[PDB]
Each structure stands twice: as structure tokens, then as C-alpha cells.
From a paper:
We present the first covalent inhibitors of Leishmania braziliensis dihydroorotate dehydrogenase (LbDHODH), a key enzyme in pyrimidine biosynthesis with a reactive cysteine (Cys131) in its active site. Among its key enzymes, dihydroorotate dehydrogenase (DHODH) is a flavoenzyme that catalyzes the fourth step and serves as a rate-limiting factor in the de novo pyrimidine biosynthesis of parasites. It facilitates the stereospecific oxidation of the (S)-dihydroorotate (DHO) isomer to orotate (ORO) via a ping-pong mechanism. Moreover, LbDHODH possesses a nucleophilic cysteine residue (Cys131) as its catalytic residue, whereas human DHODH (HsDHODH) features a serine (Ser215) at the equivalent position.
ORO was identified as an LbDHODH inhibitor with an IC50 of 61 ± 1 μM, a significant inhibitory activity given the fragment-like size of orotate. Next, to validate the mechanism of interaction between LbDHODH and ORO and to identify specific moieties for potential modification to improve inhibitor potency, we solved the crystal structure of LbDHODH in a complex with orotate. The polypeptide chains of the dimeric LbDHODH–orotate complex (chains A and B) exhibit well-defined electron density for residues Ser0 to Met312, with the exception of the catalytic loop, residues 135–138 in chain A, 135–136 in chain B, and Asp313 in both chains, which were not included in the final refined model due to the absence of clear electron density. This lack of density underscores the intrinsic flexibility of this region, which is functionally important for regulating access to the active site. In addition, the final model contains two FMN, two ORO and three glycerol molecules, four sulfate ions, and 588 solvent sites treated as water oxygens. The analysis of ORO binding profile reveals stacking interactions with FMN and an extensive hydrogen bonding network. The oxygen atom (O71) of the ORO carboxylic acid group is an acceptor in hydrogen bonds with the nitrogen atoms of Lys44 (NZ) and Leu72 (N). Similarly, the other oxygen at carboxylate group (O72) is an acceptor of a hydrogen bond with the main chain nitrogen atoms of Met70, Gly71, and Asn133. ORO atoms N1 and O2, as well as N3 and O4, form hydrogen bonds with the oxygen (OD1) and nitrogen (ND2) of Asn68 and Asn195, respectively. ORO atoms O2 and O4 also participate in hydrogen bonds with the oxygen (OG) and nitrogen (ND2) of Ser196 and Asn128, respectively.
Residue numbers in the entry:
A (entry chain B): 0 to 134, 137 to 312
B (entry chain A): 0 to 134, 139 to 312
Write the structure that this text describes.
């Protein structure tokens, strides 16, 4: 009688889980692995108009409670991911998201013009990255830029799309960002959050930073970011009730996923933990979330989505 | 041969450890325990012109990786901490910092005026809280410039600033550019809690603290990489000032990393709340241990010497 199904965006998802953009989604072999997994969906690596090798290595490092990265958007180029969406993805398995991360509003609109007919025919769904912190400061920490990008994309792209947001840390920013997003009818989902930007890890033995780019500063993922991610999910759930919220950050167990959904998440994305465990993690996360709901008597996610209680 | 001593602000500190403002420093008894502890120094609860009861409880919550709090600046009032600094603190034990967190520039100035006689006579050192997130001036640069100007005109002594965490180099540069205009700012404390996190309990399906719909500042293991980044960012950009590190310290190795990033003093919040003042005995031993394994004899030998990667 229990169900993890999600019915949103004109699609049915078997469960709310998917990878986070950037993790296990850059090559055809990785995307096929995601498609073969039990995840409810998948999303491509954020892509640019041209292929990128990304930053010098080491550019990822495992931390005691998570991860730090300055990948620098290594990706096979937009044409590769468009071809994947248009020709290779098995949509009978699960819906597909494509993440784009052009370096200007014009670069993104040019990609969207070419994505539009493929999205129309095949059903791939756009997620626009406004929060890459490792290349070009983050568009979503500049509200005038943010508004410019959304205007340019909406003019260039006929379909609804979503946005990948950086974490904010005060209600003035939650309100300011929500005010802009609610003014764009095509923004139909908000993904909270990208990594916490520009953390720093130093090794005791070497006395040296652990990644090479940008003097060691890089984005934090994993358990470090979970309370921030929940806060952002719930702040935008409250302020943007006309849009869906996707939760991303710190998900290692079905209990973590349960809390994202209680904060308001429709879909739940998995980044650092998926890098560590591989795509069988989705078998564990569905079983664990179903165990949480069984002990509480819940039969469907809408029985508790967004229903976090106050004291 | 080895020493944890830190010579700054014209004082010799026995070691770099101290409580973080707000932890174990609100009552006469807590201040005494901190003075009796082996800490190199101590700092008072951020105080306000009048007494404050603070937010409705529960307003602190222990987490497995740290803490979330929405205290609400509960404090005995500035007069109490000034009287403590004036008469009751044994300065022969260790130096004393006083934290002030007035709700405007004029409130902070008038407090500083009343504090300046006591600073001069007794040597208490001011830390100006620009980053309280539970009732942040340092997230608005125009306001932070105006606070520092008002303080510098009203206060004839050096002081320091407690900074919120920043998350990109544009904000690091802008904050440093402002701080570097004010020579009376002789130290910068990085960081205050990461603001407006949210924790929910699986069993109750409810937020775990009562104020502000459950949103509050994060401390402890969550914040350590952000704390190190902020310490090092301001160490690089403010070479003419001292950096105090605060954030995620549970062990001597944690303190060692803060010093490599640039910290002169190392403040302890969440771990001290959990462990009590005996933590400073463990922390000095552990840091001396790391130094001994590496042949270091003084903190000046590796403060800020993090290598590239
Ligand atoms: C190695 C790595 C690469 C990433 N690449 C992207 C990316 O291309 N686009 C994006 O929107 N986020 C990217 N992210 C951020 C993740 O999507 C996610 O927002 C963040 O890691 C928090 O989730 P987590 O705690 O499960 O790791 C990347 C994260 C990592 C660790
Ligand atoms: C219960 C509690 C009360 C605090 N009160 C203050 C305060 O009054 N003034 C201040 O500048 N910081 C205050 N802080 C922030 C701490 O000084 C410190 O910046 C933060 O907890 C991060 O350090 P940690 O990871 O070791 O806890 C408080 C933190 C906690 C947990
Ligand atoms: O490619 C990357 O460096 C990257 C992009 C992004 O959006 N987020 C992240 O953490 N890393
Ligand atoms: O009193 C508080 O709520 C408080 C103040 C402050 O500056 N930082 C913090 O975490 N809590």
C-alpha cells in the first residue's frame, strides 16, 4: 500500500531520488549506469557550449563528513548532452533532466534555442545552473544578473524549466530571491542547494591544502551542508508555493531524505554519497525511506511533504 | 623548549585557547570557571545596553555533528559585564575580552565610551560583534563601514571585530577593503555561526528549536571548512591585523589547522559547551603533541604557513 511515486511536471517518477548534477553523469557509461539504477530520475553534468577539461587535479577530496571540489565544469560539451537526450536516453525507464551552465546569459539562451525542439519531442527537462562556484561569480549571488538570465532564458526557451540555486543564509536573501523567481512563470522548480562555496581543507601531515585550484578553496558537499540545505528547501517551499522545490545536500540515508521531503522537497538529489557508494545507493535509500514511512503509517509522500511542524 | 605562548595586543597569552563568545560566559559563575580553567584567555557573552532574557526555549540543540542555536542575545546587561571587567576579573590569571552587540551604531558607541576608562585602567579588550544572526551588520558593507567609523571616533583604544562567514572572494575582498581602512581594528575573529540552518527531528517531524520557525546558527563540525577558509582569506588580505580562528575546534589537530591558516588565538564554542572547561587541558596537550611530532617549538613558526598544492 506504500508508494514513493511522485507526479510532477507532467511526468510520473517511481521515487523521488536522482543524482545531483555533476555526480555520475558526465559520460555515456555513467548516464547509462544512472538510467539502469533504481533512481526515479537522473540529470546530466552541467554543460557549456564547448567541451572543457576543467581544473588541474587533484580537484576533489573526500573529507571526514563530506567532500570538497573545484572541478571547474569539466564536461563533454552541450552537443554531447543534447545528443544523449535526443538519441540515447531510454525515456521508458525514467525522465531525464539536462543541466546547462553557460558563462553568460547569451551562451545559455543559445543552448536553450537548440534544446527546445528536443525537449518538445523527447521530454527532457531543463535545469539552469545559477550557482557554479569554481570557475565568473555565481549569478544567483547577484540578483540583477539573476533577473537578466531568467529574462533571457524565458525569451529564448518556450518550455518550463528549473533553476539550481546556491545556499542563502538570511531571510533578506530568501525574500529577495523568491521575489524574482515568482515573477517568472516558466521557472517551475527550484533546486536547493549547490555546494557551500569556498570552504578550505588543510591536511595535518602535509600542512598543505588538499585540492590544487584556487589556493585550495572549493565547494563543500555532504553532511556539512545538510542543515543549510534543509533551511533553503523550506525557505523557498514557503515563499514560492507556485513552484516545486527539489532538495539537494547531505543525503546519506532514507531518514535524511524523509527530512528533505518534510521540509518541502518534491525530488531528492544525491551527490557526495552517490560518488562514494555508486548507483546501488538508490536501492538502499528507497528501502530506508519506506521503512521510515512504515513506522509512521504513511502510504504516500504527499501525506507529509512540506508538513514540518513548529514548536 | 616548546611553548604555546602568543604575544599579542601587548600581552603574553599562555596559550591560544579561549571560549567563543556566548559559550560559558554569561554568569559570574561561568566567568569564574573560565578564569579558573587552563584557557589562555576568555571572553564575555555579547552584551547589550539593557539585560535581555533572550529567545523562548528550547533555543540550543545538540546535534551529532555540532549545534544549532537561536539564543537571542540573553545577557545580564552591559553594566554587569563592565562591572565584572572593572572589579571582579582577576587579571593576574589571564587577559579578558568583552563582547558587545548593540542594536545600532550609537548603542555601541555609548557602550564603548563607558568602557574606555575600564579598558585603560584594567586592560579588558573589546570584540565588536558584527554578526549576530538570531535577533548581521557585516553582511551589509555600508553599515559595517559606518559602525567601524562610529566606534573608531568614540573609542580611544584598539578593538576587534567578530565576523560572519563569507562564501566567495568578492565578499572577502570587499570586507577586507573596509577593515583595512580602520587601524584601530587590530584583530578579526572568523567566524560566527553559519546563519539560518534548519534541523528537523525525524520522530517528532518538528523543528528542534522554538524561535524563528526553527532557523538558527550552526556551530561545531559543520562549520570547520568554512571557518578555515575565512581565517585564511582574511589572513591573506589583512596582513597588518591579527586573525582569531573560531569554528569547529574539537582537537589539538583542529587548532593546529586553524593556526596554519593564520589564527593567532583559537576560540572554542560547541565543543566547550559539550565538554566544559577541562577541554582546555586536553587541547593544549594535543596541540603540543602535534608540534612535538613535527619539531615545532613556537606557534610563530607556522602561523599562516599553509602550503599550496
Ligand atoms: C564533484 C562534484 C561535481 C559537481 N558538479 C556540479 C555541476 O556540474 N552542476 C551543479 O549544479 N552542481 C554540481 N555539484 C553540486 C552537487 O550537485 C550538489 O549540489 C552538492 O554536491 C550538494 O549535494 P551533496 O551533499 O549530496 O553532495 C557538484 C558536486 C560535486 C561534489
Ligand atoms: C549557544 C551559543 C551562543 C553564542 N553566543 C554568541 C555571542 O553572544 N556572540 C558571538 O559573537 N558569538 C556567539 N556564538 C557563536 C560562537 O561564538 C562561535 O562563533 C560559533 O558557535 C562557532 O564556533 P564553534 O564551531 O566552536 O561552536 C554563540 C554560539 C552558541 C552555540
Ligand atoms: O564543476 C564544478 O566545479 C561544480 C559546479 C557546480 O555547479 N558545483 C560544484 O560544486 N562544482
Ligand atoms: O545570542 C545568540 O543568539 C547568538 C549570537 C551570536 O552572535 N551568534 C550566535 O550563534 N548566537
Amino acid at each position: 500500500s506504500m508508494s514513493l511515486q511522485v507526479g510532477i511536471l507532467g511526468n510520473t517518477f517511481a521515487n523521488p531520488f536522482m543524482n545531483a548534477a555533476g555526480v555520475m553523469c558526465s559520460t555515456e557509461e555513467e548516464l547509462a549506469a544512472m538510467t539502469e539504477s533504481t533512481s526515479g530520475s537522473l540529470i546530466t553534468k552541467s554543460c557549456t557550449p564547448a567541451l572543457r577539461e576543467g581544473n588541474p587535479a587533484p580537484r576533489y577530496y573526500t573529507l571526514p563528513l563530506g567532500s570538497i571540489n573545484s572541478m571547474g565544469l569539466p564536461n563533454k560539451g552541450f552537443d554531447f548532452y543534447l545528443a544523449y537526450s535526443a538519441r540515447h536516453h531510454d525515456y521508458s525507464r525514467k525522465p531525464l533532466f539536462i543541466s546547462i551552465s553557460g558563462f553568460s546569459a547569451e551562451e545559455n539562451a543559445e543552448m536553450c534555442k537548440r534544446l527546445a525542439p528536443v525537449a518538445a519531442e523527447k521530454g527532457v527537462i531543463l535545469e539552469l545552473n545559477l550557482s557554479c562556484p569554481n570557475v565568473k561569480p555565481q549569478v544567483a549571488y547577484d540578483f540583477d544578473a539573476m533577473r537578466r538570465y531568467l529574462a533571457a532564458i524565458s525569451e529564448a526557451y518556450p518550455h518550463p524549466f528549473g533553476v539550481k540555486m546556491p545556499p542563502y543564509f538570511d531571510f533578506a536573501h530568501f525574500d529577495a530571491a523568491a521575489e524574482i523567481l515568482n515573477q517568472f512563470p516558466k521557472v517551475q522548480f527550484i533546486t536547493c542547494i549547490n555546494s557551500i562555496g569556498n570552504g578550505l581543507v588543510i591536511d595535518v601531515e602535509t600542512e598543505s591544502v588538499v585540492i590544487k585550484p584556487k589556493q585550495g578553496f572549493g565547494g563543500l558537499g555532504g553532511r556539512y551542508v545538510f542543515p543549510t540545505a534543509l533551511a533553503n528547501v523550506n525557505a523557498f517551499y514557503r515563499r514560492c508555493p507556485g513552484k516545486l522545490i527539489f532538495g539537494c545536500g547531505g543525503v546519506y540515508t532514507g531518514e535524511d531524505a524523509f527530512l528533505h521531503v518534510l521540509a518541502g522537497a518534491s525530488m531528492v538529489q544525491v551527490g557526495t554519497a552517490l560518488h562514494e557508494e555508486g548507483a546501488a545507493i538508490f536501492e538502499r535509500l528507497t528501502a530506508e525511506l519506506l521503512d521510515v514511512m512504515a513506522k509512521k503509517g504513511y502510504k504516500a509522500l504527499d501525506e507529509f511533504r512540506g508538513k514540518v511542524k513548529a514548536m
